[PDB]
């Protein structure tokens, strides 16, 4: 069955969207941290789509066990579509997570939620330009006004029937080298995600993959060589490339 996962920052409106899509009445609150575990439901208008409400998350290197629930569901390879719920009033901050979601290889559809909040403040956001620069479908949504909901579910449903944010080519060289070291050690769909996290020296991914000493020695050498090329630490190279990619689109 087609699985759509609701991924987004805390308090961005994920459960609000879930309740409209499923007809459920899961807990919704005007403060972050209401949802703490996964909740499933059928799309009321297409009973062939199953959608998953998940706790808020800021980064695929999560800062909390609740957020790690959302990361673990994505990396369990059970989701066919990521419905990325983006707080339209906090575009830049939300898009940092969005870049990592795209790298997972699971097709991403953006629900630009709380668009009524932006409307009241007289602010505009060209969805077509944002979609063009991110490489994913984008739909302005409002769970309060109940606008755009059915539309974003259809496009998420159809991404399941991929262009990654391409960073500095010096970093892309290292990513390709780490990919060839990984081989089939990771699911092919999410190979780029694991390669980047390994470059970031992410502790979660390192503990999860359990690579051989032969693999780890080369990855370390790739990181060190690339760090010398950038004259910057590995973790900061990726963070700077994510934000630099965002500013070109925002
Ligand atoms: N104005 C406006 N408020 C919203 C929208 N979506 C959600 N909210 C409000 O934001 C708060 C948090 O929503 P919630 O569903 O709990 O977000 P979640 O934490 O990601 O699940 C609730 O008080 C909602 O009423 C929207 O599109 N527009
Ligand atoms: F902050 Al929440 F579900 F309560 F993402
Ligand atoms: Cl987080
Ligand atoms: K909330
Ligand atoms: Mg919630």
């Amino acid at each position: 069955m087609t699985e759509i996962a609701l991924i987004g920052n805390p308090n961005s409106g994920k459960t609000s969207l879930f309740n409209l899509i499923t007809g459920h009445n899961q807990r919704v609150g005007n403060w972050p941290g209401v949802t703490v575990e996964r909740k499933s439901g059928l799309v009321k208008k297409n009973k062939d789509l199953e959608i998953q409400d998940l706790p808020g998350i800021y980064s695929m290197s999560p800062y909390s066990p609740a957020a790690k629930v959302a990361r673990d569901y994505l990396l369990s390879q059970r989701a066919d579509s990521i419905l990325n719920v983006v707080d339209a009033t906090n575009l830049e901050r939300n898009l940092y997570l969005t870049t990592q979601l795209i790298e997972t290889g699971i097709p991403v559809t953006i629900a630009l939620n709380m668009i009524d909040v932006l409307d009241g403040q007289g602010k505009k956001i060209n969805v077509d330009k944002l979609s063009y620069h991110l490489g994913v479908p984008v739909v302005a949504t409002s769970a309060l006004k109940q606008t755009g909901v059915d539309q974003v579910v259809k496009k998420a449903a159809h991404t399941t029937t991929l262009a990654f944010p391409i960073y500095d080519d010096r970093l892309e060289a290292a990513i390709s080298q780490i990919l060839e070291v990984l081989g089939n050690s990771v699911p092919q769909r999410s190979a780029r995600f694991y390669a980047i996290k390994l470059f970031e020296q992410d502790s979660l991914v390192e503990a999860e993959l359990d690579l051989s000493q032969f693999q780890r020695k080369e990855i370390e050498d790739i990181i060190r060589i690339t760090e010398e090329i950038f004259t910057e630490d590995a973790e900061s190279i990726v963070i700077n490339e994510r934000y630099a990619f965002i500013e070109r689109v925002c």
Side-chain angles (χ1 to χ4, degrees), residues 7 9 57-62 71 74-75 82 84 94-106 108 134 164-165 167 190 192-194 196-197 200 202 238-239 242-243 245-246:
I7 310 296
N9 285 2
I57 175 175
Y58 289 113
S59 170
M60 285 295 282
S61 295
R71 169 194 183 273
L74 291 189
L75 301 187
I82 291 181
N84 180 208
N94 283 242
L95 286 182
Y96 178 83
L97 169 67
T98 302
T99 65
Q100 307 174 65
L101 303 179
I102 299 175
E103 298 157 350
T104 68
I106 304 171
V108 159
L134 295 171
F164 298 108
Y167 308 116
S190 306
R192 178 173 176 83
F193 166 86
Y194 285 105
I196 293 174
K197 287 301 180 193
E200 277 182 283
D202 180 72
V238 178
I239 293 181
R242 294 197 205 272
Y243 282 139
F245 166 80
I246 291 167

mmCIF file of all heavy atoms in Angstrom, residues 7 9 57-62 71 74-75 82 84 93-106 108 134 164-165 167 190 192-194 196-197 200 202 238-239 242-243 245-246, unseen atoms left out:
data_model
loop_
_atom_site.group_PDB
_atom_site.id
_atom_site.type_symbol
_atom_site.label_atom_id
_atom_site.label_comp_id
_atom_site.label_asym_id
_atom_site.label_seq_id
_atom_site.Cartn_x
_atom_site.Cartn_y
_atom_site.Cartn_z
ATOM 1 N N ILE A 7 6.342 14.807 7.078
ATOM 2 C CA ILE A 7 7.618 15.210 7.657
ATOM 3 C C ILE A 7 7.681 16.728 7.659
ATOM 4 O O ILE A 7 7.345 17.371 6.658
ATOM 5 C CB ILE A 7 8.812 14.619 6.884
ATOM 6 C CG1 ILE A 7 8.637 13.115 6.682
ATOM 7 C CG2 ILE A 7 10.105 14.889 7.632
ATOM 8 C CD1 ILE A 7 8.629 12.335 7.968
ATOM 9 N N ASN A 9 8.992 20.420 10.399
ATOM 10 C CA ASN A 9 9.385 20.971 11.683
ATOM 11 C C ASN A 9 8.238 20.855 12.684
ATOM 12 O O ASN A 9 7.073 20.747 12.297
ATOM 13 C CB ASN A 9 9.805 22.433 11.529
ATOM 14 C CG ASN A 9 11.176 22.583 10.898
ATOM 15 O OD1 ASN A 9 11.814 21.597 10.529
ATOM 16 N ND2 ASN A 9 11.637 23.823 10.773
ATOM 17 N N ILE A 57 10.303 17.431 13.461
ATOM 18 C CA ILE A 57 11.725 17.147 13.317
ATOM 19 C C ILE A 57 12.387 18.344 12.650
ATOM 20 O O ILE A 57 11.836 18.933 11.717
ATOM 21 C CB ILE A 57 11.956 15.844 12.517
ATOM 22 C CG1 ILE A 57 13.445 15.618 12.254
ATOM 23 C CG2 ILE A 57 11.170 15.863 11.211
ATOM 24 C CD1 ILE A 57 13.751 14.295 11.587
ATOM 25 N N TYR A 58 13.574 18.704 13.134
ATOM 26 C CA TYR A 58 14.338 19.801 12.554
ATOM 27 C C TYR A 58 15.447 19.333 11.626
ATOM 28 O O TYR A 58 15.818 20.067 10.703
ATOM 29 C CB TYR A 58 14.952 20.667 13.659
ATOM 30 C CG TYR A 58 13.950 21.492 14.433
ATOM 31 C CD1 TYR A 58 13.698 21.234 15.774
ATOM 32 C CD2 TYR A 58 13.259 22.532 13.825
ATOM 33 C CE1 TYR A 58 12.784 21.986 16.488
ATOM 34 C CE2 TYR A 58 12.343 23.290 14.531
ATOM 35 C CZ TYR A 58 12.110 23.013 15.862
ATOM 36 O OH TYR A 58 11.201 23.764 16.570
ATOM 37 N N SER A 59 15.983 18.134 11.843
ATOM 38 C CA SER A 59 17.136 17.655 11.099
ATOM 39 C C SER A 59 17.106 16.134 11.072
ATOM 40 O O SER A 59 16.731 15.500 12.062
ATOM 41 C CB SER A 59 18.447 18.151 11.720
ATOM 42 O OG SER A 59 19.566 17.507 11.138
ATOM 43 N N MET A 60 17.512 15.554 9.940
ATOM 44 C CA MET A 60 17.650 14.103 9.863
ATOM 45 C C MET A 60 18.804 13.574 10.708
ATOM 46 O O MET A 60 19.049 12.362 10.707
ATOM 47 C CB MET A 60 17.809 13.659 8.409
ATOM 48 C CG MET A 60 16.509 13.715 7.616
ATOM 49 S SD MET A 60 15.262 12.546 8.207
ATOM 50 C CE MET A 60 15.862 11.010 7.510
ATOM 51 N N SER A 61 19.513 14.450 11.414
ATOM 52 C CA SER A 61 20.333 14.064 12.552
ATOM 53 C C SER A 61 19.604 14.593 13.780
ATOM 54 O O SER A 61 19.960 15.651 14.315
ATOM 55 C CB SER A 61 21.747 14.639 12.445
ATOM 56 O OG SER A 61 22.445 14.087 11.342
ATOM 57 N N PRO A 62 18.583 13.879 14.245
ATOM 58 C CA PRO A 62 17.598 14.488 15.142
ATOM 59 C C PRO A 62 18.162 14.814 16.512
ATOM 60 O O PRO A 62 19.131 14.211 16.981
ATOM 61 C CB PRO A 62 16.500 13.424 15.238
ATOM 62 C CG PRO A 62 17.206 12.141 14.967
ATOM 63 C CD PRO A 62 18.286 12.463 13.975
ATOM 64 N N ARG A 71 12.628 10.221 11.756
ATOM 65 C CA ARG A 71 13.779 9.797 10.965
ATOM 66 C C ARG A 71 13.783 8.288 10.760
ATOM 67 O O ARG A 71 14.060 7.804 9.656
ATOM 68 C CB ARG A 71 15.078 10.240 11.636
ATOM 69 C CG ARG A 71 16.323 9.620 11.020
ATOM 70 C CD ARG A 71 17.531 9.819 11.909
ATOM 71 N NE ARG A 71 18.757 9.296 11.318
ATOM 72 C CZ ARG A 71 19.165 8.037 11.433
ATOM 73 N NH1 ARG A 71 18.442 7.164 12.120
ATOM 74 N NH2 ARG A 71 20.295 7.650 10.859
ATOM 75 N N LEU A 74 11.352 7.068 8.056
ATOM 76 C CA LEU A 74 11.849 7.331 6.709
ATOM 77 C C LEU A 74 12.918 6.321 6.313
ATOM 78 O O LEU A 74 12.886 5.764 5.209
ATOM 79 C CB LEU A 74 12.395 8.757 6.621
ATOM 80 C CG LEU A 74 11.363 9.883 6.700
ATOM 81 C CD1 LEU A 74 12.001 11.223 6.369
ATOM 82 C CD2 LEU A 74 10.191 9.598 5.774
ATOM 83 N N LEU A 75 13.871 6.064 7.208
ATOM 84 C CA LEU A 75 14.973 5.163 6.901
ATOM 85 C C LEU A 75 14.598 3.693 7.029
ATOM 86 O O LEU A 75 15.408 2.834 6.664
ATOM 87 C CB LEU A 75 16.168 5.471 7.803
ATOM 88 C CG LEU A 75 16.695 6.901 7.678
ATOM 89 C CD1 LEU A 75 17.974 7.064 8.469
ATOM 90 C CD2 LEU A 75 16.913 7.271 6.219
ATOM 91 N N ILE A 82 7.363 11.332 0.649
ATOM 92 C CA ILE A 82 7.522 12.281 1.745
ATOM 93 C C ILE A 82 6.680 13.509 1.431
ATOM 94 O O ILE A 82 6.930 14.208 0.442
ATOM 95 C CB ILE A 82 8.994 12.663 1.958
ATOM 96 C CG1 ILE A 82 9.787 11.480 2.512
ATOM 97 C CG2 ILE A 82 9.101 13.857 2.897
ATOM 98 C CD1 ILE A 82 11.245 11.795 2.773
ATOM 99 N N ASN A 84 6.375 16.830 2.661
ATOM 100 C CA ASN A 84 7.157 17.730 3.500
ATOM 101 C C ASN A 84 6.308 18.950 3.842
ATOM 102 O O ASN A 84 6.007 19.772 2.972
ATOM 103 C CB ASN A 84 8.445 18.129 2.784
ATOM 104 C CG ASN A 84 9.308 19.068 3.607
ATOM 105 O OD1 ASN A 84 10.068 19.868 3.060
ATOM 106 N ND2 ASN A 84 9.202 18.970 4.927
ATOM 107 N N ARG A 93 14.401 28.401 7.579
ATOM 108 C CA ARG A 93 14.657 27.437 8.645
ATOM 109 C C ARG A 93 14.094 26.064 8.302
ATOM 110 O O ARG A 93 14.719 25.037 8.595
ATOM 111 C CB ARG A 93 14.070 27.944 9.963
ATOM 112 N N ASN A 94 12.913 26.024 7.681
ATOM 113 C CA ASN A 94 12.293 24.744 7.355
ATOM 114 C C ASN A 94 13.023 24.045 6.214
ATOM 115 O O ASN A 94 13.157 22.816 6.216
ATOM 116 C CB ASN A 94 10.820 24.948 7.001
ATOM 117 C CG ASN A 94 9.950 25.158 8.224
ATOM 118 O OD1 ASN A 94 9.042 24.374 8.496
ATOM 119 N ND2 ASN A 94 10.227 26.221 8.971
ATOM 120 N N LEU A 95 13.498 24.812 5.230
ATOM 121 C CA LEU A 95 14.125 24.221 4.053
ATOM 122 C C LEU A 95 15.437 23.512 4.368
ATOM 123 O O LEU A 95 15.896 22.705 3.552
ATOM 124 C CB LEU A 95 14.350 25.291 2.984
ATOM 125 C CG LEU A 95 13.086 25.735 2.246
ATOM 126 C CD1 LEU A 95 13.415 26.757 1.169
ATOM 127 C CD2 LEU A 95 12.360 24.534 1.656
ATOM 128 N N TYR A 96 16.059 23.800 5.515
ATOM 129 C CA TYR A 96 17.255 23.060 5.908
ATOM 130 C C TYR A 96 16.952 21.572 6.038
ATOM 131 O O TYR A 96 17.712 20.725 5.556
ATOM 132 C CB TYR A 96 17.814 23.621 7.216
ATOM 133 C CG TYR A 96 19.028 22.882 7.739
ATOM 134 C CD1 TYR A 96 20.301 23.170 7.261
ATOM 135 C CD2 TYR A 96 18.903 21.904 8.717
ATOM 136 C CE1 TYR A 96 21.413 22.498 7.738
ATOM 137 C CE2 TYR A 96 20.008 21.229 9.201
ATOM 138 C CZ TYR A 96 21.261 21.529 8.707
ATOM 139 O OH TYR A 96 22.363 20.857 9.188
ATOM 140 N N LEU A 97 15.837 21.238 6.690
ATOM 141 C CA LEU A 97 15.400 19.847 6.747
ATOM 142 C C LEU A 97 15.016 19.334 5.365
ATOM 143 O O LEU A 97 15.275 18.171 5.035
ATOM 144 C CB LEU A 97 14.227 19.705 7.717
ATOM 145 C CG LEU A 97 13.483 18.366 7.691
ATOM 146 C CD1 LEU A 97 14.375 17.243 8.203
ATOM 147 C CD2 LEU A 97 12.191 18.445 8.490
ATOM 148 N N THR A 98 14.393 20.191 4.550
ATOM 149 C CA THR A 98 13.921 19.772 3.231
ATOM 150 C C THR A 98 15.056 19.221 2.376
ATOM 151 O O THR A 98 14.882 18.211 1.682
ATOM 152 C CB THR A 98 13.240 20.944 2.523
ATOM 153 O OG1 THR A 98 12.157 21.429 3.327
ATOM 154 C CG2 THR A 98 12.705 20.513 1.165
ATOM 155 N N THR A 99 16.221 19.871 2.406
ATOM 156 C CA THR A 99 17.356 19.394 1.622
ATOM 157 C C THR A 99 17.743 17.974 2.016
ATOM 158 O O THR A 99 18.055 17.145 1.152
ATOM 159 C CB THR A 99 18.552 20.333 1.790
ATOM 160 O OG1 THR A 99 19.002 20.298 3.150
ATOM 161 C CG2 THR A 99 18.166 21.758 1.421
ATOM 162 N N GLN A 100 17.720 17.672 3.315
ATOM 163 C CA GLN A 100 18.057 16.327 3.770
ATOM 164 C C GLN A 100 16.993 15.318 3.356
ATOM 165 O O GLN A 100 17.315 14.172 3.021
ATOM 166 C CB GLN A 100 18.247 16.324 5.286
ATOM 167 C CG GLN A 100 19.236 17.368 5.772
ATOM 168 C CD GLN A 100 19.304 17.451 7.280
ATOM 169 O OE1 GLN A 100 19.713 16.503 7.949
ATOM 170 N NE2 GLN A 100 18.899 18.590 7.827
ATOM 171 N N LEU A 101 15.719 15.721 3.379
ATOM 172 C CA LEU A 101 14.647 14.821 2.963
ATOM 173 C C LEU A 101 14.787 14.433 1.496
ATOM 174 O O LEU A 101 14.541 13.278 1.128
ATOM 175 C CB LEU A 101 13.286 15.468 3.216
ATOM 176 C CG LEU A 101 13.007 15.908 4.653
ATOM 177 C CD1 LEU A 101 11.635 16.554 4.754
ATOM 178 C CD2 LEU A 101 13.128 14.730 5.608
ATOM 179 N N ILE A 102 15.165 15.386 0.643
ATOM 180 C CA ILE A 102 15.329 15.088 -0.777
ATOM 181 C C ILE A 102 16.446 14.074 -0.981
ATOM 182 O O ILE A 102 16.338 13.165 -1.814
ATOM 183 C CB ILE A 102 15.589 16.381 -1.572
ATOM 184 C CG1 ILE A 102 14.406 17.341 -1.441
ATOM 185 C CG2 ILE A 102 15.834 16.061 -3.037
ATOM 186 C CD1 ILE A 102 14.639 18.687 -2.095
ATOM 187 N N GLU A 103 17.530 14.203 -0.212
ATOM 188 C CA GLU A 103 18.668 13.300 -0.348
ATOM 189 C C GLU A 103 18.321 11.860 0.011
ATOM 190 O O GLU A 103 19.044 10.943 -0.392
ATOM 191 C CB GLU A 103 19.829 13.796 0.512
ATOM 192 C CG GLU A 103 20.336 15.167 0.097
ATOM 193 C CD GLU A 103 21.057 15.891 1.213
ATOM 194 O OE1 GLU A 103 21.004 15.415 2.366
ATOM 195 O OE2 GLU A 103 21.673 16.943 0.939
ATOM 196 N N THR A 104 17.238 11.641 0.762
ATOM 197 C CA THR A 104 16.825 10.285 1.107
ATOM 198 C C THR A 104 16.432 9.467 -0.115
ATOM 199 O O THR A 104 16.297 8.246 -0.011
ATOM 200 C CB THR A 104 15.656 10.310 2.094
ATOM 201 O OG1 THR A 104 14.490 10.829 1.440
ATOM 202 C CG2 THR A 104 15.988 11.174 3.300
ATOM 203 N N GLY A 105 16.190 10.112 -1.254
ATOM 204 C CA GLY A 105 15.731 9.412 -2.431
ATOM 205 C C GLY A 105 14.257 9.092 -2.437
ATOM 206 O O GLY A 105 13.745 8.621 -3.461
ATOM 207 N N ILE A 106 13.560 9.317 -1.332
ATOM 208 C CA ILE A 106 12.104 9.192 -1.314
ATOM 209 C C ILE A 106 11.504 10.459 -1.916
ATOM 210 O O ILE A 106 11.853 11.566 -1.475
ATOM 211 C CB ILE A 106 11.602 8.965 0.109
ATOM 212 C CG1 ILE A 106 12.280 7.738 0.723
ATOM 213 C CG2 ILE A 106 10.092 8.792 0.122
ATOM 214 C CD1 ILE A 106 12.007 7.560 2.203
ATOM 215 N N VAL A 108 9.811 13.767 -2.692
ATOM 216 C CA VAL A 108 9.350 14.791 -1.763
ATOM 217 C C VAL A 108 8.309 15.661 -2.454
ATOM 218 O O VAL A 108 8.517 16.117 -3.585
ATOM 219 C CB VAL A 108 10.527 15.644 -1.253
ATOM 220 C CG1 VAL A 108 10.031 16.981 -0.718
ATOM 221 C CG2 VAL A 108 11.301 14.892 -0.180
ATOM 222 N N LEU A 134 13.957 23.941 -6.129
ATOM 223 C CA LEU A 134 14.080 22.775 -5.263
ATOM 224 C C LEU A 134 13.970 21.459 -6.021
ATOM 225 O O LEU A 134 14.480 20.441 -5.541
ATOM 226 C CB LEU A 134 13.022 22.830 -4.159
ATOM 227 C CG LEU A 134 13.171 23.988 -3.169
ATOM 228 C CD1 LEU A 134 11.962 24.079 -2.258
ATOM 229 C CD2 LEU A 134 14.447 23.842 -2.355
ATOM 230 N N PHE A 164 18.436 15.949 -7.097
ATOM 231 C CA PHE A 164 18.955 16.299 -5.787
ATOM 232 C C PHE A 164 19.554 17.699 -5.803
ATOM 233 O O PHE A 164 20.085 18.138 -6.828
ATOM 234 C CB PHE A 164 20.032 15.304 -5.341
ATOM 235 C CG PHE A 164 19.539 13.896 -5.204
ATOM 236 C CD1 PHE A 164 19.904 12.929 -6.126
ATOM 237 C CD2 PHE A 164 18.709 13.538 -4.155
ATOM 238 C CE1 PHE A 164 19.451 11.628 -6.003
ATOM 239 C CE2 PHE A 164 18.253 12.239 -4.027
ATOM 240 C CZ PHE A 164 18.623 11.283 -4.951
ATOM 241 N N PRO A 165 19.451 18.439 -4.690
ATOM 242 C CA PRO A 165 20.182 19.708 -4.589
ATOM 243 C C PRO A 165 21.663 19.472 -4.812
ATOM 244 O O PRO A 165 22.340 18.879 -3.966
ATOM 245 C CB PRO A 165 19.886 20.174 -3.158
ATOM 246 C CG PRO A 165 18.604 19.504 -2.804
ATOM 247 C CD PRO A 165 18.648 18.168 -3.488
ATOM 248 N N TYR A 167 25.399 20.481 -4.875
ATOM 249 C CA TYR A 167 26.221 21.392 -4.101
ATOM 250 C C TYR A 167 27.529 21.663 -4.843
ATOM 251 O O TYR A 167 27.695 21.291 -6.009
ATOM 252 C CB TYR A 167 26.476 20.813 -2.708
ATOM 253 C CG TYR A 167 25.226 20.384 -1.972
ATOM 254 C CD1 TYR A 167 25.012 19.050 -1.646
ATOM 255 C CD2 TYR A 167 24.266 21.312 -1.594
ATOM 256 C CE1 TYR A 167 23.873 18.653 -0.968
ATOM 257 C CE2 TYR A 167 23.125 20.925 -0.916
ATOM 258 C CZ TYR A 167 22.933 19.595 -0.606
ATOM 259 O OH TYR A 167 21.798 19.206 0.068
ATOM 260 N N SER A 190 18.525 5.563 -1.094
ATOM 261 C CA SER A 190 18.996 6.539 -0.119
ATOM 262 C C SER A 190 20.517 6.581 -0.022
ATOM 263 O O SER A 190 21.056 7.039 0.992
ATOM 264 C CB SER A 190 18.390 6.243 1.253
ATOM 265 O OG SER A 190 16.977 6.165 1.177
ATOM 266 N N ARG A 192 22.795 8.447 -1.555
ATOM 267 C CA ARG A 192 23.330 9.801 -1.428
ATOM 268 C C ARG A 192 23.177 10.333 -0.007
ATOM 269 O O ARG A 192 24.089 10.981 0.522
ATOM 270 C CB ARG A 192 22.648 10.738 -2.425
ATOM 271 C CG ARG A 192 23.124 12.177 -2.321
ATOM 272 C CD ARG A 192 22.549 13.048 -3.423
ATOM 273 N NE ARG A 192 22.929 14.448 -3.255
ATOM 274 C CZ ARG A 192 24.088 14.961 -3.654
ATOM 275 N NH1 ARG A 192 24.988 14.192 -4.252
ATOM 276 N NH2 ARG A 192 24.349 16.247 -3.457
ATOM 277 N N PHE A 193 22.026 10.082 0.621
ATOM 278 C CA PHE A 193 21.806 10.532 1.993
ATOM 279 C C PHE A 193 22.854 9.956 2.939
ATOM 280 O O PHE A 193 23.464 10.686 3.729
ATOM 281 C CB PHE A 193 20.397 10.150 2.450
ATOM 282 C CG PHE A 193 20.184 10.265 3.934
ATOM 283 C CD1 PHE A 193 19.809 11.473 4.500
ATOM 284 C CD2 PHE A 193 20.343 9.164 4.763
ATOM 285 C CE1 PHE A 193 19.610 11.586 5.864
ATOM 286 C CE2 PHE A 193 20.147 9.270 6.127
ATOM 287 C CZ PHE A 193 19.778 10.482 6.679
ATOM 288 N N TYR A 194 23.072 8.641 2.876
ATOM 289 C CA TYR A 194 24.047 8.011 3.761
ATOM 290 C C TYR A 194 25.460 8.495 3.462
ATOM 291 O O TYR A 194 26.264 8.683 4.383
ATOM 292 C CB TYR A 194 23.960 6.490 3.639
ATOM 293 C CG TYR A 194 22.760 5.892 4.337
ATOM 294 C CD1 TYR A 194 21.669 5.433 3.612
ATOM 295 C CD2 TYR A 194 22.719 5.787 5.720
ATOM 296 C CE1 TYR A 194 20.569 4.884 4.246
ATOM 297 C CE2 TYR A 194 21.623 5.241 6.363
ATOM 298 C CZ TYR A 194 20.551 4.792 5.621
ATOM 299 O OH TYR A 194 19.459 4.247 6.256
ATOM 300 N N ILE A 196 26.353 11.450 2.382
ATOM 301 C CA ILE A 196 26.523 12.803 2.904
ATOM 302 C C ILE A 196 26.655 12.780 4.421
ATOM 303 O O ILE A 196 27.522 13.450 4.996
ATOM 304 C CB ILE A 196 25.353 13.698 2.458
ATOM 305 C CG1 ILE A 196 25.388 13.909 0.943
ATOM 306 C CG2 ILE A 196 25.384 15.033 3.192
ATOM 307 C CD1 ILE A 196 24.187 14.648 0.406
ATOM 308 N N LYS A 197 25.796 12.009 5.092
ATOM 309 C CA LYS A 197 25.883 11.886 6.544
ATOM 310 C C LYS A 197 27.232 11.319 6.975
ATOM 311 O O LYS A 197 27.790 11.738 7.996
ATOM 312 C CB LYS A 197 24.737 11.021 7.066
ATOM 313 C CG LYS A 197 23.378 11.705 7.034
ATOM 314 C CD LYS A 197 23.382 12.983 7.858
ATOM 315 C CE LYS A 197 22.025 13.670 7.823
ATOM 316 N NZ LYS A 197 22.086 15.062 8.347
ATOM 317 N N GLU A 200 29.547 14.076 6.822
ATOM 318 C CA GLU A 200 29.284 14.881 8.010
ATOM 319 C C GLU A 200 29.822 14.240 9.280
ATOM 320 O O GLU A 200 29.781 14.879 10.338
ATOM 321 C CB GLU A 200 27.781 15.118 8.171
ATOM 322 C CG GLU A 200 27.226 16.259 7.343
ATOM 323 C CD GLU A 200 25.742 16.469 7.572
ATOM 324 O OE1 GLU A 200 24.937 15.683 7.033
ATOM 325 O OE2 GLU A 200 25.382 17.415 8.301
ATOM 326 N N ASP A 202 28.386 11.885 10.836
ATOM 327 C CA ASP A 202 27.189 11.699 11.645
ATOM 328 C C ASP A 202 27.283 10.405 12.442
ATOM 329 O O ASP A 202 27.488 9.329 11.872
ATOM 330 C CB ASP A 202 25.948 11.695 10.755
ATOM 331 C CG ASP A 202 24.666 11.505 11.544
ATOM 332 O OD1 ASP A 202 24.250 12.449 12.248
ATOM 333 O OD2 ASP A 202 24.072 10.409 11.461
ATOM 334 N N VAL A 238 29.187 20.837 4.733
ATOM 335 C CA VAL A 238 27.855 20.413 4.311
ATOM 336 C C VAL A 238 26.805 21.429 4.740
ATOM 337 O O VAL A 238 25.910 21.779 3.963
ATOM 338 C CB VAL A 238 27.546 19.007 4.857
ATOM 339 C CG1 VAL A 238 26.138 18.581 4.464
ATOM 340 C CG2 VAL A 238 28.570 18.008 4.348
ATOM 341 N N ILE A 239 26.895 21.915 5.982
ATOM 342 C CA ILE A 239 25.942 22.912 6.463
ATOM 343 C C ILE A 239 25.986 24.159 5.589
ATOM 344 O O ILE A 239 24.943 24.711 5.216
ATOM 345 C CB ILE A 239 26.216 23.246 7.941
ATOM 346 C CG1 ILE A 239 25.919 22.034 8.825
ATOM 347 C CG2 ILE A 239 25.389 24.446 8.383
ATOM 348 C CD1 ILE A 239 26.137 22.289 10.299
ATOM 349 N N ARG A 242 24.304 23.407 2.244
ATOM 350 C CA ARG A 242 22.849 23.364 2.346
ATOM 351 C C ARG A 242 22.261 24.770 2.355
ATOM 352 O O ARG A 242 21.361 25.087 1.569
ATOM 353 C CB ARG A 242 22.426 22.604 3.605
ATOM 354 C CG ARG A 242 22.774 21.124 3.618
ATOM 355 C CD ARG A 242 21.954 20.404 4.678
ATOM 356 N NE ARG A 242 22.597 19.185 5.159
ATOM 357 C CZ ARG A 242 22.450 17.990 4.599
ATOM 358 N NH1 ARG A 242 21.686 17.848 3.525
ATOM 359 N NH2 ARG A 242 23.071 16.935 5.110
ATOM 360 N N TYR A 243 22.757 25.626 3.253
ATOM 361 C CA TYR A 243 22.256 26.995 3.341
ATOM 362 C C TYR A 243 22.516 27.768 2.053
ATOM 363 O O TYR A 243 21.630 28.471 1.552
ATOM 364 C CB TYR A 243 22.887 27.705 4.539
ATOM 365 C CG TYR A 243 22.269 27.319 5.863
ATOM 366 C CD1 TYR A 243 23.060 27.101 6.983
ATOM 367 C CD2 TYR A 243 20.895 27.169 5.992
ATOM 368 C CE1 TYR A 243 22.499 26.747 8.196
ATOM 369 C CE2 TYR A 243 20.324 26.815 7.202
ATOM 370 C CZ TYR A 243 21.132 26.605 8.300
ATOM 371 O OH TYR A 243 20.568 26.252 9.507
ATOM 372 N N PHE A 245 22.680 26.611 -0.853
ATOM 373 C CA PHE A 245 21.679 26.149 -1.809
ATOM 374 C C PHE A 245 20.318 26.769 -1.521
ATOM 375 O O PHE A 245 19.564 27.087 -2.447
ATOM 376 C CB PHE A 245 21.589 24.622 -1.782
ATOM 377 C CG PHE A 245 20.375 24.074 -2.476
ATOM 378 C CD1 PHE A 245 20.348 23.952 -3.855
ATOM 379 C CD2 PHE A 245 19.259 23.687 -1.752
ATOM 380 C CE1 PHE A 245 19.232 23.453 -4.501
ATOM 381 C CE2 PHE A 245 18.139 23.187 -2.391
ATOM 382 C CZ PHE A 245 18.125 23.071 -3.767
ATOM 383 N N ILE A 246 19.987 26.944 -0.240
ATOM 384 C CA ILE A 246 18.701 27.526 0.130
ATOM 385 C C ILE A 246 18.624 28.983 -0.311
ATOM 386 O O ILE A 246 17.632 29.416 -0.908
ATOM 387 C CB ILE A 246 18.466 27.383 1.645
ATOM 388 C CG1 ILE A 246 18.234 25.917 2.012
ATOM 389 C CG2 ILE A 246 17.291 28.240 2.089
ATOM 390 C CD1 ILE A 246 18.294 25.646 3.496
#
